[PDB]
Design an enzyme around this catalytic site. Sequence first.
Site, short mmCIF file in Angstrom:
data_model
loop_
_atom_site.label_atom_id
_atom_site.label_comp_id
_atom_site.label_asym_id
_atom_site.label_seq_id
_atom_site.Cartn_x
_atom_site.Cartn_y
_atom_site.Cartn_z
N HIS A 41 44.77 6.36 65.31
CA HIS A 41 45.52 6.54 64.07
C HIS A 41 46.69 7.49 64.28
O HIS A 41 47.25 8.01 63.31
CB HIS A 41 44.60 7.01 62.93
CG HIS A 41 44.02 8.39 63.08
ND1 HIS A 41 44.78 9.54 63.03
CD2 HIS A 41 42.73 8.80 63.18
CE1 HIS A 41 44.00 10.60 63.14
NE2 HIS A 41 42.75 10.18 63.24
N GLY A 146 44.55 18.64 61.58
CA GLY A 146 45.10 18.87 62.89
C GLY A 146 44.08 18.89 64.01
O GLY A 146 44.46 19.05 65.18
N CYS A 148 41.98 16.34 64.85
CA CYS A 148 41.58 15.04 65.38
C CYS A 148 41.84 14.96 66.89
O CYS A 148 42.82 15.50 67.41
CB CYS A 148 42.30 13.89 64.66
SG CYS A 148 41.91 13.70 62.91
#
Lengths: 301, 299
Positions: A41, A146, A148
């Site tokens: 993503h 932040g 991920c």
Amino acid sequence: SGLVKMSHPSGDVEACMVQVTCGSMTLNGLWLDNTVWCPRHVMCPADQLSDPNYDALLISMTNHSFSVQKHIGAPANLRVVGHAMQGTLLKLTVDVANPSTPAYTFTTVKPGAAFSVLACYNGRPTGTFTVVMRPNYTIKGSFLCGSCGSVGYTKEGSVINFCYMHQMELANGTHTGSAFDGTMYGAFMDKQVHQVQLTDKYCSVNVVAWLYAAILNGCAWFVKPNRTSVVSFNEWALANQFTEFVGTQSVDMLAVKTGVAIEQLLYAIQQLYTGFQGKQILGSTMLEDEFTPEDVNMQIM
Amino acid sequence: LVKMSHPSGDVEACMVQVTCGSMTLNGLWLDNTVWCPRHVMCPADQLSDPNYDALLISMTNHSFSVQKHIGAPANLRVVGHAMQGTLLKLTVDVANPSTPAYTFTTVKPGAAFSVLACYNGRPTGTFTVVMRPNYTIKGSFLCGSCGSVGYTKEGSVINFCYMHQMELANGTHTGSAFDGTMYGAFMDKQVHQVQLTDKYCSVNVVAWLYAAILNGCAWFVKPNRTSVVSFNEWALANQFTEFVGTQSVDMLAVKTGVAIEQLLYAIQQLYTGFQGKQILGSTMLEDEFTPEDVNMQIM
Ligand SMILES: CC(C)(C)[C@H](NC(=O)C(F)(F)F)C(=O)N1C[C@H]2[C@@H]([C@H]1C(=O)N[C@H](C=N)C[C@@H]1CCNC1=O)C2(C)C
């Protein structure tokens, strides 16, 4: 009581964290040899994150679409020269192999098992902690935005087993992510849509381990002669929010050391679940299932 | 809210094995100095009450051996031994190229630090502890863990605050600050030693109630208030520490609307019993999370 939440020293993994950026989206990546891993993503624009089209987003890209930097230790001349999609992860190929690459494997973690998490922000490690993969295939981490692409792992001999890349937070304080084959734990979708988890259960084998740890630290008032067979226990467990008890050699070692049988603890679990009647086990008034048998063996020996 | 500790790569690059005669334990390698607990000089037989002044005198130019196993291995040459309280400062002829910027702090009770547990100079685990009001920690240390190091990291500077020394009569631990003095004044000698009674860290319980309110669990917030003075007088007789507020606790009070004094009164109530209900899934006061923990993790 002797039982702390212990993690693997994170130095090995610290040397493999990078920042992946794709236009103006940015998150964390794992640089192993000539490959960088990160959640897919990262190709997605915030507008289109509610129902995105990853195959479309992918053909849209070339090598030049991605940038990888390394902010920690020796600096970061990293040219993407390849890119592929793999389940819910992007597999970038970079032109420099990581000199700090540890010996490693990719393996999926089963419910009840414990791993270490290295929380990273903009490719910078900030904290480490340890979690247990829940029966509903989530983890209770501490993940802010932040984070991920933060990595979860366990260590064997010299071999790191990477098992978890962070992706999502569900409606509770509850997180999920991917294995390094791209699949998501619990089949959740990397789409910003409302998604409900399944109801959680207790990991039975870990509750047994904790009970052994109490008997080892002289807390054994819950131990009686009465026994519940494993087959009998697993029937009772299906109706009471408990996982199938599956024995291992770690559990067996604790049985021999304390001289208290598994079947005695399976019986106690059945009585303690209805309430401790105001007594205390290792400082607690509820069953604890976050210590694996391997943990009790390591810490109490 | 998870027990969370500092990434340890920096400190892993400073751990070494110090060896003296037939005793071995861990040390910390900073610049040209290797620090380690002085009882490496004590023979196993004679730990009961040793003469550390005599032992340092009996040391010769090759009485100590220092190995680095992690990273590029190395034999470091000792070129000078000093004592300082309950620690040795060994001087080595090579400076650690991975020496980070560091300071030598002393944790006050209630403060949380990260611990890097080592055996034979190899890191094996990392966890986080709060220094207890009686100056012990509830760690997980086995034999061979002495010289394991506790630290915090302000910015990019590592604040070294603990070197592990001993396990007391319960499963509790203590060690040295890096000025050589032992938290709680315990003695590095094998004798039964009495720890004082523990107490709840009032300011951490207050932090935890704020983490509850931040997460919806606000049932215990009544309008009654107890003043800091009042509470502190009460704490002296209810196993609680004196409350000392901080700017970190103020952040929690501002982003919440609940005053420090409301929660001080709540603690006087919750101490008597939770009256059936639960706070953040618990039936007891939790005191191992600090205001900085709650700030960082519920920003
Ligand atoms: C636990 C034992 C009964 C052995 C003893 N305790 C007491 O003598 C007390 F009762 F005084 F506490 C004790 O710890 N030691 C005896 C001797 C050193 C120390 C020691 O071997 N320390 C190791 C760290 N340097 C780690 C220990 C190993 C077990 N788990 C640990 O953490 C000194 C106090 C000089």
